[PDB]
Amino acid sequence: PHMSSTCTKVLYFTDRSLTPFMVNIPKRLEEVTLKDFKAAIDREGNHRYHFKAMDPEFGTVKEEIFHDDDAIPGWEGKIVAWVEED
Structure with a gap:
């Protein structure tokens, strides 16, 4: 089955x-x-959800996101994320 x-x-x-x-x-x-x-x-x-992002000020960071409806950061078809127990 193909994507x-x-x-x-x-x-x-x-x-x-x-x-x-x-x-x-x-x-x-x-x-x-x-x-x-x-x-x-x-x-x-x-x-809790943290995502690989580039901020023009801090450089590469793990930026927390909270809301179901928020867009998530990625690059060239890739997302990198970390999950924690809250």
Whole structure:
């Protein structure tokens, strides 16, 4: 079963693993929201979400995002995220 090109691949780290997980979002990227990431990683409970971003002032940072509806940062079809127990 084959996927479309409107994939965005996500690497995510978890509290409970040393090795990242890789999953895909069936959205482009300018379309992915915390809602979609949430679903994709399908972990349940209370978590905090931090994402690889570039801020023009601080450089590369892990920027926390909270709201289902917020857009999430990525680059060239890739998202990098960290999940924690909250």
